[PDB]
């Protein structure tokens, strides 16, 4: 029996739902008319969002309005879900991760670096439609645990007291302010101090 894995809107403009493979169709309805609970329609795009998915572009996506969605296996309903696109935001990861050396202690043991990046290219932070906060995490390539820094609201930040001999890896992830997101971590940045 096929089940929904999850739905997600990477930029509060479009969204897609995915399910497990195990004919299967997807039918949806939105509260854009009270007579909705029965005016079902079929997935506007069964391919774009990949294998076993359904993709809703801008014309089919509205925020703050309830969407009910159901999955059928051979016409028979096997799964159903209800949500609002604002409720399902989860942004892409930051781009262009880089670092600059800030300080070097005379003990030859510690150095401070400045880590910087760029927001997901599809997030409209420029015209205010989206506001992201980031979580930066870093550790030595031999540490089991990652150190995480309190939510950053900007696209640069200094991590302090990195031991010059050891090598480090840093990852960063985005989240729309006040949402249930936190997308995928960026590509890991390896820092080998000079």
């Amino acid at each position: 029996e096929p089940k929904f894995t999850k739905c997600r809107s990477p930029e509060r403009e479009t969204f897609s739902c995915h399910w497990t493979d195990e004919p299967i169709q997807l039918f949806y309805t939105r509260r854009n008319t009270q007579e909705w609970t029965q005016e079902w329609k079929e997935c506007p795009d069964y391919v774009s969002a990949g294998e076993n998915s359904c993709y809703f572009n801008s014309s089919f996506t509205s925020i703050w309005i309830p969407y009910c969605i159901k999955l059928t296996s051979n016409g028979g309903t096997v799964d159903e879900k209800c949500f609002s696109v604002d409720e399902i935001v989860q942004p892409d990861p930051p781009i262009a991760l880089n670092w600059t050396l800030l300080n070097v202690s005379l003990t030859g043991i510690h150095a401070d670096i400045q880590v910087r990046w760029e927001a997901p290219r599809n997030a409209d932070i420029q015209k205010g439609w989206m506001v992201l906060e980031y979580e930066l995490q870093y550790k030595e390539v031999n540490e089991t645990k990652w150190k995480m820094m309190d939510p950053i609201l900007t696209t640069s930040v200094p991590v302090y007291s990195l031991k010059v001999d050891k090598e480090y890896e840093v990852r960063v992830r985005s989240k729309q302010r006040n949402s249930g997101n936190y997308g995928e971590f960026s590509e890991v940045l390896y820092v080998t101090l000079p």
């Binding site: 403009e13 703050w64 009910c68 506001v131 006040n178």
Partner: protein, 184 residues
């Protein structure tokens, strides 16, 4: 005398909008996680009225494209009405807030923050008179009035979170357009 630069006006506004939104989200998530299972959430969202908030009497944009088509004055006006509509109803969240482990979550604090933001939007509308004719069902209409307790509290809380999101979002759109450089 000194005039507060439009930038500090917007920033304080955004600090208020954001705080209100965060408080709504946090108390909402908290209530849900403890009293509302997916089952009831789904039922609620498709039940008659229920998923309908009193504040929906106000025509607000529902997507990026539509929001971006509104003038600064309308977006501020809409945000004003949304704030005003909650001045009275928050009283009803008193029981929810009393048992909440969220700091700042109280009918009194939330009311004061709403009042302060209301003065803020009113201040902005006075500066941002930018073309937009003061005509339309947005300038010719008032805030919305409110009418199992658990669900009632849950629906009140679900709508609060949503309306605060609209406000924070709508003000931001106006900020980026007016305050050059605050976003990019």
């Amino acid at each position: 005398f000194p005039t507060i630069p439009l930038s500090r006006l917007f920033d304080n506004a955004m600090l208020r909008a954001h705080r209100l939104h965060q408080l709504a989200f946090d108390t909402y998530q908290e209530f849900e996680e403890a009293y509302i299972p997916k089952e009831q959430k789904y039922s609620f969202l498709q039940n008659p009225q229920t998923s309908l908030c009193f504040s929906e009497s106000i025509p607000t944009p529902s997507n990026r494209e539509e929001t971006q088509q509104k003038s600064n004055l309308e977006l501020l006006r809409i945000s004003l009405l949304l704030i005003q509509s909650w001045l009275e109803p928050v009283q009803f969240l008193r029981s929810v807030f009393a048992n909440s482990l969220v700091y700042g979550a109280s009918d009194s604090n939330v009311y004061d923050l709403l009042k302060d933001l209301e003065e803020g939007i009113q201040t902005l509308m006075g500066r941002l008179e930018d073309g937009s004719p003061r005509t339309g069902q947005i300038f010719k209409q008032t805030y919305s009035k409110f009418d199992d307790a658990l669900l009632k509290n849950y629906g009140l809380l679900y709508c609060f979170r949503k309306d605060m999101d609209k406000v924070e979002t709508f003000l931001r759109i106006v900020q980026c357009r007016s305050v050059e450089g605050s976003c990019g």
